[PDB]
Amino acid sequence: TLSAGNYIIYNRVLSPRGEKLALTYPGRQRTPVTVSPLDGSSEQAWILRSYDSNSNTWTISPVGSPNSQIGWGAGNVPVVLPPNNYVWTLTLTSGGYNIQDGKRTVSWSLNNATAGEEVSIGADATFSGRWVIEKV
Amino acid sequence: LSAGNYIIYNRVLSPRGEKLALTYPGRQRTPVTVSPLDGSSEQAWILRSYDSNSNTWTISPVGSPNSQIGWGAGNVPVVLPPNNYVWTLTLTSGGYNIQDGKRTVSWSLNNATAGEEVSIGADATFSGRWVIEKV
Numbered sequence A: 001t002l003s004a005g006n007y008i009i010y011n012r013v014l015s016p017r018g019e020k021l022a023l024t025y026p027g028r029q030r031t032p033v034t035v036s037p038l039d040g041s042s043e044q045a046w047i048l049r050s051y052d053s054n055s056n057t058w059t060i061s062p063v064g065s066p067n068s069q070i071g072w073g074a075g076n077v078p079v080v081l082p083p084n085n086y087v088w089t090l091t092l093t094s095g096g097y098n099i100q101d102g103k104r105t106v107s108w109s110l111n112n113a114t115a116g117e118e119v120s121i122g123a124d125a126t127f128s129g130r131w132v133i134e135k136v
Numbered sequence B: 001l002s003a004g005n006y007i008i009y010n011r012v013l014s015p016r017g018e019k020l021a022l023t024y025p026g027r028q029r030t031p032v033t034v035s036p037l038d039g040s041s042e043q044a045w046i047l048r049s050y051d052s053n054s055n056t057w058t059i060s061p062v063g064s065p066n067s068q069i070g071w072g073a074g075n076v077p078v079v080l081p082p083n084n085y086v087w088t089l090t091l092t093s094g095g096y097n098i099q100d101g102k103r104t105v106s107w108s109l110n111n112a113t114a115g116e117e118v119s120i121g122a123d124a125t126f127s128g129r130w131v132i133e134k135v
């Protein structure tokens, strides 16, 4: 069962060249969060903190800006923001992690699963709507 | 793509994040599956150009290098005594589409799990695309 700590978060769907596509901090706030080939950089490392354990909700912070939190951006993409109790449900399904809002109305997915793609917040897509979360 | 020895794995990882590589089941006439990439000879395949004008290739396990992957009953691939069984290997912007010679069906995975049989049929988003790497 997931515990609080530092993680990489990558998609079940590889890039066309076979690279694991890891959730990537874009270096500043209010800017879409993307995926890029797994490379061990700090931009790919995220702090998961348990918010409401009874609802399975978590805050997600970049290791490089550990006080900020991933929130829900305009145009339905995640962006990093000053803290304000922005939380996500992290459900381990038989198909991997479903990353959803608190109310489980939307899921994070990738439209094409390519290097540099923005993460989409919306309908639960087969395969690209599932994630792998591994401890650093 | 040049002739030689390759691993062939799906774009869709297993639920735990493992690359799922085309795996020889150890004998002929039996469904070919995927399993986590592990470097075993059962995951190594010989690609030989057949008709470079139609982009077709034969695919043979290294553990029985004269046998060829053919189209099994129930729409799964199986390894067979040779008979010019060929597959079109088209590199798309989404990776390799592995199709019959007539380009009517594609190989894909239904759930993308360890030990799953490869399906021959409709082209599925993501699991119908493959990565082919020299080994």
Ligand SMILES: CC(=O)N[C@@H]1[C@@H](O[C@@H]2O[C@@H](C)[C@@H](O)[C@@H](O)[C@@H]2O)[C@H](O[C@@H]2O[C@H](CO)[C@H](O)[C@H](O[C@]3(C(=O)O)C[C@H](O)[C@@H](NC(C)=O)[C@H]([C@H](O)[C@H](O)CO)O3)[C@H]2O)[C@@H](CO)O[C@H]1O
Pocket (backbone or CB within 6 Å): A071, A072, A073, A074, A075, A076, A084, A085, A086, A087, A088, A089, A100, A101, A102, A103
């Ligand atoms: C624990 C708690 O209640 N936290 C509050 C936040 O909600 C938690 O985090 C979000 C990401 C979801 O997972 C929630 O289910 C969860 O409880 C809350 O964040 C706001 O949550 C609301 C829903 O309750 C909504 O998702 C907000 O996202 C949007 C929106 O869809 O309305 C997304 C838009 O891009 C954004 N547009 C802007 C900022 O221009 C809008 C916009 O803020 C509102 O429409 C106008 O107010 O929000 C999400 O931000 C947080 C702020 O409300 O409060 C926490 O207490």
